[PDB]
Chains A and B, each alone.
Chain A
């Protein structure tokens, strides 16, 4: 009963932390109703607020303990750290606020909560830190108490209670006020009394050149200092800062202010000191996606009311081009590393035109470019546009490779969407021609590729880098002479190492090289070679990269006698898929091993084996273990109630992998009782169970299946529904 409660609560917290639902004001209500939902019988106990906060404290600490103490059994390079940073952010940011506006400011309850923990967590944390590395080794408990001090929750005499008996902390040194302090140009800590005004004032005077070249922290801009010093922000103030961006960003879309839109996207993309992760950890990524995709979709109507007959048009067109081009880079970074799908948001919001959405089909075909150039895709049945489609290709090739200048007429007559596909087409044709031997002059091309770096033509580089590895992978296996190979690097180095960069293109060029760097580095090392890796490692070191082996980035001289793994999930012959899933069967059945409570290592494992084979190889294999060994935890093989709770562990886990939000549960109950519902959950178990339920019922009318077999299958189905309806999601 207690074990059931703790398992259910740990999996519930893990799922809710993954699902970005911390910002939901229903967190405490669901956490309180967990106890009543788990026990079918009525449990009418008045749980006081201190009890709720204490339960949250030990639940979070034990969950983090298991999360960090299950990592040694993983592969040493099966690196997934998004959830680790997510735990850190939650425990250091939200729980202090949960106490702040949920607690009664009782110092005793905090002492009881942090004194009731086992020493196993402390021993494991210290052992792991020592193995990774006396040097200052602070734990997550110190950061928890420090945040409470800034909120006036506890006096400065409380931190000394939990400190080691030999080392104290000076009370005066610890910050005690929640006011923003920034180092000015003269070194005086200035008080930022107003947050929104500070952002807009700095944003207006912000320079796009100061993004990556300003390695030093002594920058005159206060806002840029905050990004590199993001780890020390006050607990309550960062919520205001995150909310400040949202209100400012939504207003910029309404007013069509192109200057501030492009600058904002540059800060968020690079993710200095884990800046972008905290943003999703406060606003829901769905709402952020909706406004962001509205701009990229509704921008079509904005080009029919502007006439290029003013000297500010070239300023505006560059401002328009960069505002649109940067907004694309924000989506790709979110989709690739942060695990968000563009298709899902369109289904949830009916106001998005799926069939007429250019963004949706662009991302899914990002690494692949069409061999033919089409001005419009929905009207391929017409030939009038195809006549001038070839005209555009020859017009751009002659002007950029022979004339050496870009006429203003070409830019005005073409849209950004055609440019996003025109640039990959031309570079592919030139690069392919060079490789075969059609093009033999390099020097004219080196200057030619310089024109792709202008602010007007910046959006055309997004698809250029993705195609490179597919181009390079064939090159790696194919036999290419060094004379051609050194030429390929010469043409490539022009895009990689420009001689000069404009004040609006230097940060953009680094940003695009950061999206698809990792697979490029692996292919390049398989072979003027060093500068490309030197440039690639330089752009990889500007900010941390998630789920990457740090040995790969700095493998210049380190030789640990262990082969590097470039992927999130890695498998060897010594530890094949059999051993891990046999250890999963030992955990799916007897809850052995230590790979559980790790949805990083499990969700990817499910996909690698597919939900069908994952469920098929465990459901029917359970009987063999059950028929011989028996139900663990009971010394008597009497009754099926003991085995009933064991089945609840397996079915409750599958529910969370299917249901992700609150209102979604109320609609899946109607799916079972019988269009838009199953669209979002193509790979869910619920679809697989329901599609077989209706199909075998059809055979029941025709009588090709025994009645006993049909009764067995519905037993699994009704159990899934029964827990779905009795538990609130």
Chain B
């Protein structure tokens, strides 16, 4: 039997929403990955919910498919689930009718049965009282049973990377990122969202919401637009795969109706703006359909063995590839033979001097039980019977795990790597599909999710490498995992799966030689900077851009997890203090800009004193500065720790356990960042002194306390200000004395000084 290709969906924000078929009080579950003790990981507690058609005011039905709106560049928070009865239930997470909430709390938008608006925040089953709802099983495949659900993206563009190559001239890996223009059908900004669903009887649906209204609208048609309803209700489509094509507002509805035993093709057209001359009049989009082609399947192979169509998966192909025609991969299995044939067809127009052109045939040695297409990766995954997975690339259908062995090394570009799977990281012995409810390869292909019948919790399997004793392969592996994150950030993926896989390999290295594992981290994170065209050895102008960059919230988090096992080590400590300084940065400069605008509001709003709006405005002015006082206590408490270590290190310079103090001062932007914090602190105090609170003396305590805490600090800030300023100048002249770029990495990440610069350490 075919597995649950759409039973589970990894949302782009990490929420794992999957269908539940065992609990008698719930049908859907929500969970996510969390860290146990900084080293290990565990899934979060399952948040069970119950979905029935009568939430608007009682038996609930099973869940057919779950589709997170993670397609293209969508935010990925609006989850729409379609049940077995055909009702499409849309749940929005991260928002409440009155306020904003976290990502683990759900909320409804509208229910379909006719469609109506009813906003109501859902509650978990366990917390809710025992209700009179029983699991009624809709064991009937209705006319409205949705076969395939597809989301509609907006007009925004997505920028990703295609592949990287090893530049033998510079002995470094180089990657190029190509912007991907939108292809297929995209909804305009004035429409809040749109989605399409194909029902098993051929009836189509088009849900959409206007951005300026709350009422929802639905437009429905049927594929077989014949004059007789006798054939209208006959199109029982076995497979209905919707692949958008480069044609404008067109989707190729590749259907296989067993009534006529032919793989029929269709074209769907939508006009977003019917009246372009009247932009104010927002008209409903018009839907059109046009039959194109139909072909019959081949009965036999070349040698005389008959074939059976097991699956019909067509790849969502963009215009980037050489031939943009979608690949209709009609799978065939030779009976009583381990071989499995995958014939490939392409749809092309008929040219004068449409049609399906056969390119080639590919033979696989094991039977296939599941096919899943990766998103933004162009990878077809063949989940064979024995548990092994062979992901074939869309470009050449060359095995990714064995591409390095068979790659033609000679050439301009060598060692073409697209994912960590190219290095050789193969999954272990996965559980057999008969025992497995559903599988899904993780987005980065680093591991596989398996749900088990007797396991109440989801499992997880990571990739392993057999030749971990060979030291010469560390250069390639670090670069391969470096590019794995490069694609993830461009697609706004959490990439928590990739983090787990990297740590396991490092842990096995550290068991034999602890010295070797430390260098693996340094080389791995260095390639990230080269891939993203960011240089820690650049002039100071780019350095300001680095501090505000989102990646440091994640790339520094990498060593926060990859260095957790190393007790009494400063690799994670150096990243955390810089990361927390960023939080410290968001505290003062986050409100320094806010406080500056409050100065102008005082003068222009001084003509109405008795109004009931100024009194709340006045109260909020002096309340905000009060909340900064607890932050300032940790700000002073932080600078004392580094000054305390100065006295300790002088007596015993040979103590390696206190080498963190070197990296903190060595960081180039941190010295400027603290100076900027000290600059705005002076500006804030000068402004407060220049513009004190006079209407209410009682409110001056917060302003006065700000002056007192600075003066009463055990160490004067002015003396400490000159401390970091002098370090910057001395560390710049040393660069001119001898050119070196590793020292920039050493002062920022390694938190150490190379032995070749042992004289520099004595100066501190």
Contact = CB atoms under 8 A, between A and B. Distances in A.
A362 to B, nearest CB: 11
Given A438-B352, A563-B227, A705-B434, A354 B296 contact: no
A371 B453 CA distance: 51
Interface string B432-458: 111110000000000000001110000
A393 B230 CA distance: 44
Contacts of B350: 371, 432
Contacts of A705: 432, 434-435, 453
A354 B233 contact: no
Nearest to A691: B367
A610 B309 CA distance: 12
B308 A571 contact: no
B432 A570 contact: no
A704 B434 CA distance: 9
Contacts of A406: none
Given A371-B355, A581-B140, A624-B137, A565 B228 contact: yes
Contact of B300 (A354, A473, A577, A607): A354
A343 interface: yes
Given A365-B296, A367-B296, A699 B234 contact: no
Given A610-B238, A705-B434, A474 B300 contact: no
A612 B231 CA distance: 24
Contacts of B258: 607-608, 610
Interface residues of A, number: 67
B231 to A, nearest CB: 7
Given A355-B303, A371-B350, A582-B140, A571 B234 contact: yes
B291 interface: yes
B564 interface: no
Nearest to B291: A477
Interface in B292-332: 292-300, 302-306, 308
Contacts of B238: 610
Q: Main SS of chain A's interface residues?
A: helix
Given A364-B296, A477-B291, A607-B258, A566 B231 contact: yes
Nearest to A354: B304
B233 A360 contact: no
Interface in B94-152: 137, 139-143
B236 interface: yes
B306 A682 contact: yes
Contacts of B454: 706
Interface in B733-749: none
Q: Main SS of chain B's interface residues?
A: loop
Contacts of B352: 432-433, 436, 438
Contacts of B290: 477-478
B336 interface: yes
A570 B1 contact: no
A576 B143 contact: yes
Nearest to A378: B302
A382 to B, nearest CB: 16
Interface residues of B, number: 55
A678 B335 contact: yes
Contacts of B453: 705-706, 709
B296 A696 contact: no
Contacts of A289: none
B452 A608 contact: no
Nearest to A697: B434
A277 to B, nearest CB: 23
Contact of A364 (B299, B304, B357): B299
Nearest to A478: B290
B435 A679 contact: no
B496 interface: no
Contact of B293 (A433, A470, A565): A470
A714 to B, nearest CB: 13
A704 B143 contact: no
Nearest to A352: B304
Interface in B244-296: 258-259, 290-296
Interface string A569-610: 111110011100110000000000000000000000001111
Interface string B407-436: 000000000000000000000000111111
Contacts of B432: 695-696, 698-699, 702, 704-705
B385 interface: yes
A526 B299 CA distance: 33
Interface in B633-672: none
A189 interface: no
A77 interface: yes
A368 interface: yes
Contacts of A343: 299-300, 306
Query: Which 4 A/B pairs are nearest by Cβ-Cβ distance?
Result: A354-B304, A563-B228, A704-B435, A565-B230
Interface of A: 77, 343, 347, 353-355, 360-361, 364-368, 371, 432-433, 436, 438, 470, 473-474, 477-478, 526, 563-567, 569-573, 576-578, 581-582, 607-610, 612-613, 616-617, 620-621, 624, 675, 677-679, 682-683, 687, 692, 695-696, 698-699, 702, 704-706, 709
Given A564-B228, A617-B141, A683-B308, 12 more contacts: A343-B299, A347-B306, A360-B300, A365-B296, A438-B352, A573-B233, A577-B142, A577-B236, A578-B142, A608-B258, A609-B236, A704-B434
21 contacts: A360-B300, A361-B299, A433-B352, A474-B293, A569-B259, A573-B143, A576-B143, A581-B140, A607-B258, A608-B258, A616-B1, A617-B141, A675-B337, A679-B336, A687-B335, A695-B385, A698-B432, A704-B432, A704-B435, A705-B432, A706-B454
